[PDB]
Design an enzyme around this catalytic site. Structure first.
Site, PDB file in Angstrom:
ATOM      1  CG  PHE A  57       0.219   8.957   5.731  1.00 53.20           C
ATOM      2  CD1 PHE A  57       0.122   7.739   6.394  1.00 53.20           C
ATOM      3  CD2 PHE A  57      -0.846   9.312   4.908  1.00 53.20           C
ATOM      4  CE1 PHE A  57      -1.004   6.939   6.269  1.00 53.20           C
ATOM      5  CE2 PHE A  57      -1.963   8.507   4.788  1.00 53.20           C
ATOM      6  CZ  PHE A  57      -2.043   7.332   5.483  1.00 53.20           C
ATOM      7  CG  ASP A  58       3.404   3.832   6.106  1.00 51.98           C
ATOM      8  OD1 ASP A  58       4.604   3.729   5.837  1.00 51.98           O
ATOM      9  OD2 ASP A  58       2.786   3.068   6.835  1.00 51.98           O
ATOM     10  CG  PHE A  99      -4.745   3.799   2.389  1.00 53.04           C
ATOM     11  CD1 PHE A  99      -5.692   4.386   3.199  1.00 53.04           C
ATOM     12  CD2 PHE A  99      -3.504   3.472   2.941  1.00 53.04           C
ATOM     13  CE1 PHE A  99      -5.399   4.663   4.531  1.00 53.04           C
ATOM     14  CE2 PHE A  99      -3.210   3.723   4.268  1.00 53.04           C
ATOM     15  CZ  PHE A  99      -4.169   4.326   5.058  1.00 53.04           C
ATOM     16  CE1 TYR A 115      -4.796   5.221  13.195  1.00 54.68           C
ATOM     17  CE2 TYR A 115      -4.805   5.957  10.932  1.00 54.68           C
ATOM     18  CZ  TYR A 115      -4.409   5.050  11.888  1.00 54.68           C
ATOM     19  OH  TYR A 115      -3.635   3.963  11.514  1.00 54.68           O
ATOM     20  CB  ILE A 160      -8.130   2.414  10.193  1.00 52.28           C
ATOM     21  CG1 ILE A 160      -7.630   2.183   8.770  1.00 52.28           C
ATOM     22  CG2 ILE A 160      -7.168   3.253  11.024  1.00 52.28           C
ATOM     23  CD1 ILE A 160      -7.490   3.444   7.969  1.00 52.28           C
ATOM     24  CE1 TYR A 176       0.996  -0.542   4.433  1.00 44.58           C
ATOM     25  CE2 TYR A 176       0.490   1.784   4.293  1.00 44.58           C
ATOM     26  CZ  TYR A 176       1.100   0.733   4.963  1.00 44.58           C
ATOM     27  OH  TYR A 176       1.788   0.854   6.170  1.00 44.58           O
TER      28      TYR A 176
HETATM   29  C1  LIG Z   1       2.094  -0.214   9.153  1.00 43.49           C
HETATM   30  C2  LIG Z   1       1.113   0.477  10.074  1.00 43.49           C
HETATM   31  C3  LIG Z   1      -0.421   0.437   9.881  1.00 43.49           C
HETATM   32  C4  LIG Z   1      -0.994   1.152  11.130  1.00 43.49           C
HETATM   33  N1  LIG Z   1      -2.430   0.897  11.375  1.00 43.49           N
HETATM   34  C5  LIG Z   1      -2.810   0.318  12.738  1.00 43.49           C
HETATM   35  C6  LIG Z   1      -2.349   1.156  13.793  1.00 43.49           C
HETATM   36  C7  LIG Z   1      -1.704   0.623  14.920  1.00 43.49           C
HETATM   37  C8  LIG Z   1      -1.242   1.449  15.932  1.00 43.49           C
HETATM   38  C9  LIG Z   1      -1.442   2.818  15.847  1.00 43.49           C
HETATM   39  C10 LIG Z   1      -2.107   3.336  14.736  1.00 43.49           C
HETATM   40  N2  LIG Z   1      -2.570   2.491  13.705  1.00 43.49           N
HETATM   41  C11 LIG Z   1      -3.384   1.079  10.426  1.00 43.49           C
HETATM   42  O1  LIG Z   1      -4.527   0.760  10.768  1.00 43.49           O
HETATM   43  C12 LIG Z   1      -3.241   1.669   9.099  1.00 43.49           C
HETATM   44  C13 LIG Z   1      -3.714   0.792   8.002  1.00 43.49           C
HETATM   45  C14 LIG Z   1      -2.713  -0.345   7.826  1.00 43.49           C
HETATM   46  C15 LIG Z   1      -1.287   0.212   7.552  1.00 43.49           C
HETATM   47  C16 LIG Z   1      -0.835   1.134   8.587  1.00 43.49           C
HETATM   48  N3  LIG Z   1      -1.853   2.163   8.895  1.00 43.49           N
HETATM   49  S1  LIG Z   1      -1.624   3.682   8.193  1.00 43.49           S
HETATM   50  N4  LIG Z   1      -2.865   4.403   8.282  1.00 43.49           N
HETATM   51  O2  LIG Z   1      -0.949   3.579   6.854  1.00 43.49           O
HETATM   52  C17 LIG Z   1      -0.406   4.472   9.229  1.00 43.49           C
HETATM   53  C18 LIG Z   1       0.870   4.713   8.762  1.00 43.49           C
HETATM   54  C19 LIG Z   1       1.813   5.344   9.597  1.00 43.49           C
HETATM   55 CL1  LIG Z   1       3.378   5.663   9.065  1.00 43.49          CL
HETATM   56  C20 LIG Z   1       1.430   5.748  10.863  1.00 43.49           C
HETATM   57  C21 LIG Z   1       0.146   5.498  11.330  1.00 43.49           C
HETATM   58 CL2  LIG Z   1      -0.372   6.004  12.876  1.00 43.49          CL
HETATM   59  C22 LIG Z   1      -0.772   4.882  10.497  1.00 43.49           C
END
Ligand SMILES: C=C[C@H]1CN(Cc2ccccn2)C(=O)[C@@H]2CCC[C@H]1N2[S@](=N)(=O)c1cc(Cl)cc(Cl)c1
Length: 128
Positions: free
Chosen positions: A55-56, A118, A101, A75, A45
């Site tokens: 951001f990722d 995404f 979030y 999420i 992704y």
């Molecule tokens: C590799 C990290 C994941 C983080 N999470 C779960 C999660 C776990 C703990 C804190 C916040 N979110 C997620 O639910 C989502 C969707 C799957 C990919 C990615 N994220 S994300 N939205 O890309 C993401 C990416 C980054 Cl760099 C930071 C954060 Cl807080 C969230």
């Protein structure tokens, strides 16, 4: 660009039909089967904020992101969205904060009240 296009041309995949998660299928995947609750799902992704920042990205890490579907490890929109995908599918999701979030955001990367974009590729799904 792609975020605007899924905003304006995406389909609502929520159970509530509140337009909180919109989807466009970019590449049709294989057959008819989608993963089930508990499957170990492997995805690639990229995520962008509404200010254009990437951001990722799992591609940038050279490894897929792995989670168990439908167990609240991600999420809400991911549990909903990935559950609609076939193996090999590439999709775009446009996600309102209520399915991501919310007012909290997620420090430091995600602001409060953030609508997220995404691109997701479902690589494989296995197990429960
Ligand atoms: C590799 C990290 C994941 C983080 N999470 C779960 C999660 C776990 C703990 C804190 C916040 N979110 C997620 O639910 C989502 C969707 C799957 C990919 C990615 N994220 S994300 N939205 O890309 C993401 C990416 C980054 Cl760099 C930071 C954060 Cl807080 C969230």
């Amino acid at each position: 660009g792609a975020p605007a296009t899924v905003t304006e041309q995406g389909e609502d995949i929520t159970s509530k039909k509140d337009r909180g998660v919109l989807k466009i299928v970019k590449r049709v995947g294989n057959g008819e089967e989608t993963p089930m609750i508990g499957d170990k799902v492997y995805v690639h992704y990229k995520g962008k904020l509404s200010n254009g920042k990437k951001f990722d990205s799992s591609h940038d890490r050279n490894e897929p992101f792995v989670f168990s579907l439908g167990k609240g490890q991600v999420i809400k929109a991911w549990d909903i969205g990935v559950a609609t995908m076939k193996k090999g599918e590439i999709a775009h999701l446009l996600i309102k904060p209520e399915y991501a979030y919310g007012s909290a955001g997620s420090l430091p990367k995600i602001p409060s009240n953030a609508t997220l974009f995404f691109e997701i590729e479902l690589l494989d799904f296995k197990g429960e």
